[PDB]
Design a protein around this ligand. Structure first.
Ligand SMILES: *C/C=C(C)/C=C/C=C(C)/C=C/C1=C(C)CCCC1(C)C
Length: 227
């Protein structure tokens, strides 16, 4: 179809694929059992992002939704990606600060709501309602971020300065990147359609890749993954 954004899809596929292979080889060569968890989870993020990025590049994960008097292109494959990749990244942090089971449960659930109402809004035909679902999805994200900032950061204090310092970095990267998605959605094709689809795809690959490959490298290169 030669759509104005295939350039960004092919670059995301390439970066996600590269990060996936490096983590895979870096994780399968480690003998520390207690380290496997982090490597398997971290390699699994790029992995999923790769496949979904490849599908969109090939013309899938796309559907036209009617609203605003137009037939808007909605790349739904993104949510199929985020549904499994966000809670997995949340788990990496949870296993890092000795996060309690009840906490992990609440974070995974809130995350489920976030992507759930997120896709529903992106598929809604009543323009104004799309922003209703967007509003609920965003609130769920702020909850997760609250727990990550106030809660998780407090537990990372019972760790060594090595585990507490690696978490603050991953927490900071997660807070900055996750915070930008709702805005990108709001002013993009799923929202006010102010920023064209090609730019939007560019903004997402940068965020996706930074929050996945950029997240994995920091976590896997550190020595705080050695329980
Ligand atoms: C690898 C992907 C990552 C780390 C994705 C993070 C995605 C978010 C924090 C997405 C948030 C959204 C909202 C707050 C509301 C509107 C719809 C979403 C799903 C784009």
């Amino acid at each position: 179809t030669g759509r104005p954004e295939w350039i960004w899809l092919a670059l995301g596929t390439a970066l996600m694929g590269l990060g996936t292979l490096y983590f895979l080889v870096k994780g399968m060569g480690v003998s520390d059992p207690d380290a496997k968890p982090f490597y398997a989870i971290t390699t699994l993020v790029p992995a999923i992002a790769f496949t979904m990025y490849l599908s969109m590049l090939l013309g899938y994960g796309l559907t036209m939704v009617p609203f605003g008097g137009e037939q808007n292109p909605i790349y739904w494959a993104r949510y199929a990606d985020w549904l499994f990749t966000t809670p997995l990244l949340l788990l990496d942090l949870a296993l890092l600060v000795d996060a309690d089971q009840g906490t992990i449960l609440a974070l995974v659930g809130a995350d489920g709501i976030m992507i759930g109402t997120g896709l529903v809004g992106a598929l809604t035909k009543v323009y104004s309602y799309r922003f209703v679902w967007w509003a609920i999805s965003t609130a769920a994200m702020l909850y997760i971020l609250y727990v990550l900032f106030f809660g998780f950061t407090s537990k990372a204090e019972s760790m060594r300065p090595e585990v507490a310092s690696t978490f603050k970095v991953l927490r900071n990267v997660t807070v900055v990147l996750w915070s930008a998605y709702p805005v990108v959605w709001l002013i993009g094709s799923e929202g006010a359609g102010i920023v064209p689809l090609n730019i939007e795809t560019l903004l997402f690959m940068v965020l996706d890749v930074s929050a996945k490959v950029g997240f994995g490298l920091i976590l896997l290169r550190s020595r705080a993954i050695f329980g």
